[PDB]
């Protein structure tokens, strides 16, 4: 038996209700250094979003795709320069930069 | 609470702490050299002196109840002296709490068998002097102020 485990809610007015249409997406904005390292990851990998999402644990692949589409639609010269430049794939230094970004966001939250 | 009276009380409590454990000789020598009681009459107004003495006794009793027997006896007999040297018309009674009476009763029961002869005598004299007036709060308390 439910031993006062839940509390009654005074919601769902019998009169009527309306719609929302926006439930879960609720993305989170980027930053300057984050956009810089994102362009770096682009120049390093390409357009395959699977690897980008695998290497970005704290940001969703859907958000990465939205950012890439927004960049392609607004700043084309930046994407062109990113594709022009290339960098060999690094793993240890990339993890170090990930830890640095974690520390930076921690400091931001502290601020 | 009074700002300066509390400081004077704390200073006298430290002076009694730095003395022997339990001995009226220290009380006598302190009263003789320092004479902590200086601002009793002077040249002040009626209600000013009245509230001065009232707050003095109230705070000195409120402090009476963690510090050792030295501090306890020091506060108690500071109150005793301030009451016995009461040249004013109210003869202001020392404000006490309800359970404080049972506390001091247990204290006397303990003194019955202990090296506190002079202390028990002074407390018995203070009791006979009808100097205690017990309440529920060591001060006055309301909800508007």
């Amino acid at each position: 038996c439910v031993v006062e485990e839940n509390d009654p809610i005074f919601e769902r007015g019998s009169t009527t209700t309306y719609s929302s249409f926006r439930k879960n997406y609720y993305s989170k904005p980027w930053s300057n250094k984050e956009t810089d390292m994102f362009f770096l990851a682009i120049s390093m990998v390409g357009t395959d979003f699977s690897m980008i999402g695998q290497l970005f644990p704290h940001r969703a692949r859907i958000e990465i795709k939205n950012k890439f589409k927004r960049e392609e639609k607004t700043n084309g010269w930046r994407i062109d320069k990113a594709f022009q430049e290339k960098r060999p794939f690094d793993f240890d230094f990339f993890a170090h930069l990930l830890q640095k970004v974690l520390a930076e966001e921690e400091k931001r939250k502290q601020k | 609470t009074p700002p300066g009276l509390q400081t004077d009380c704390e200073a006298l409590l430290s002076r009694f702490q730095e003395t022997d454990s339990v001995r009226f000789e220290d009380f006598t020598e302190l009263w003789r050299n320092m004479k902590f009681g200086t601002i009793f009459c002077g040249r002040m107004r009626n209600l000013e002196k009245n509230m001065f003495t009232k707050e003095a006794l109230a705070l000195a009793w409120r402090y009476f109840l963690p510090y050792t027997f030295q501090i306890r006896v020091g506060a108690l007999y500071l109150l005793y002296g301030l009451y016995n040297t009461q040249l004013c018309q109210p003869k202001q009674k020392i404000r006490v709490a309800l359970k404080d009476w049972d506390e001091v009763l247990k204290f006397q029961q303990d003194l019955v068998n202990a090296q506190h002869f002079d202390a028990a005598y002074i407390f018995r004299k203070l009791r006979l002097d009808r100097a205690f007036h017990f309440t529920a709060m060591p001060k006055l308390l309301s909800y508007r102020m």
Binding site: - | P3, G4, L5, T7, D8, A11, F24, T28, W31, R32, M34, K35, G37, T38, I39, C41, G42, R43, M44, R45, N46, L47, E48, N50, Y80, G81, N84, T85, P90, K91, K93, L98, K99, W101, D102, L105, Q108, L111, V112, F117, D118, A120, Y121, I122, R124, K125, R130, H133, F134, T135, A136, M137, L140, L141, S142, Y143, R144, M145
Partner: protein
């Protein structure tokens, strides 16, 4: 209905605000039981004294006449410091000297201490006064409760209106005595319209007409049933409280002439209600509970005598500003203000001719200024 089960000791509930519930009769009984009494007689001393002191110390815990003599010789007044309090290392003496300087600067001699002298006189009025009859002697250990009765429903949000009146009450006495002793000016106030007939003596004042009155302490409704013209607003109060599940539990109803202060269950520092005349509400705050002492009033016929009073500013005549107003006029053309106030002579000479005919249309009402008791 029995009292709320609780210990006599007033255990604290909120920091320096108020304690929990407790009884008054049992509290006083235990208080008198945990003591010996027989000290409210002022019979210390107006010869053989050494033997008496020896017997006293023998019956007591010390049993040492020599030590007693030494201690009493040490504790004397011949060794007590009138003289200027200076020439000694002190702390509060600096504040004292600064206050003396401020006095010599601003205060003139000894005056402007109006409230101070008021408190002094109201406290001295109860010092060693004996009753007229020998049967009116207050027995030892009588409960004395200090009560603050806030009558005004509004206050100065600026200053919070800290000071106000404060009275004393006895435990053994009934609550009807306090009810009748409350000096509420709403009782003296009078209604009705007396514009056409100003010389008509106001009769059947609100005090006599609106006899409805009751108390409220911890969900207990005490309704006065002494007079056959007292209604029961507690009926409608309980109806409203029970018409909906608002979280308020069942409340008990009792008579005010059968329950005394001892049978009450109160909380020191908690506000209770005293409602009469329908909307005239008073906030009751029982602050302290103390026993009777030989230095206090020992006359039971004078225990309700208020110990602290408030200085209520009176409304002066809006016309001359020299006399206190006694009549309030509404919808008056001759009046310079809508809610206007006039005194006797000014109202007579402004609203009536030499013969006394009503000049102009208006609505006059007897205005009983708040400062009527003082």
């Amino acid at each position: 209905v029995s009292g709320s089960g609780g210990c006599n000791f007033p255990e604290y509930e909120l920091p320096e605000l108020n304690t929990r519930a407790f009884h008054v009769g049992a509290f006083g009984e235990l208080w008198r039981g945990r003591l010996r009494g027989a000290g409210d007689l002022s019979l210390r001393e107006p010869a053989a004294d050494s033997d008496r002191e020896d017997a006293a110390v023998a019956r007591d815990l010390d049993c040492s006449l020599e030590a007693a003599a030494e201690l009493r010789a040490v504790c004397g007044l011949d060794k007590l410091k009138e003289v200027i309090p200076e020439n000694t290392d002190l702390v509060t003496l600096g504040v004292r000297k600064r206050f003396l300087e401020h006095r010599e600067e601003t205060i003139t001699i000894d005056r402007a201490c109006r409230q101070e002298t008021f408190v002094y006189e109201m406290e001295s009025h109860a010092i060693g006064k004996k009753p007229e009859n020998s049967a009116d002697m207050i027995e030892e250990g009588e409960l004395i409760l200090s009560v603050n009765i806030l009558y005004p429903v509004i206050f100065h949000k600026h200053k919070e209106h800290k000071p106000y009146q404060t009275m004393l009450v006895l435990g053994s006495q009934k609550l009807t005595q306090l009810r009748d002793s409350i000096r509420c000016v709403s009782d003296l106030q009078i209604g009705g319209e007396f514009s056409n007939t100003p010389d008509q003596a106001p009769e059947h004042i609100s005090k006599d007409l609106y006899k409805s009155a009751f108390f409220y302490f911890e969900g207990t409704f005490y309704n006065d049933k002494r007079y056959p013209e007292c209604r029961d607003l507690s009926r409608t109060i309980i109806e409203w409280s029970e018409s909906h599940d608002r979280g308020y539990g069942k409340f008990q109803t009792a008579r005010m002439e059968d329950f005394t202060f001892n049978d009450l269950c109160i909380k020191l520092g908690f506000p209770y209600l005293y409602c009469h005349q329908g909307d005239c509400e008073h906030v009751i705050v029982i602050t302290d509970i103390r026993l009777v002492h030989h230095d206090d009033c020992l006359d039971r016929t004078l225990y309700p005598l208020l110990i602290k009073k408030h200085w209520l500013w009176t409304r002066k005549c809006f016309v001359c500003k020299m006399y206190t107003a006694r009549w309030v006029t509404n919808n008056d053309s001759f009046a310079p203000e809508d809610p206007c106030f006039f005194c006797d002579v000014c109202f007579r000479m402004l609203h009536y001719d030499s013969e006394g005919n009503k000049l102009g249309e208006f609505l006059a009402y007897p205005y009983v200024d708040p400062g009527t008791f003082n």
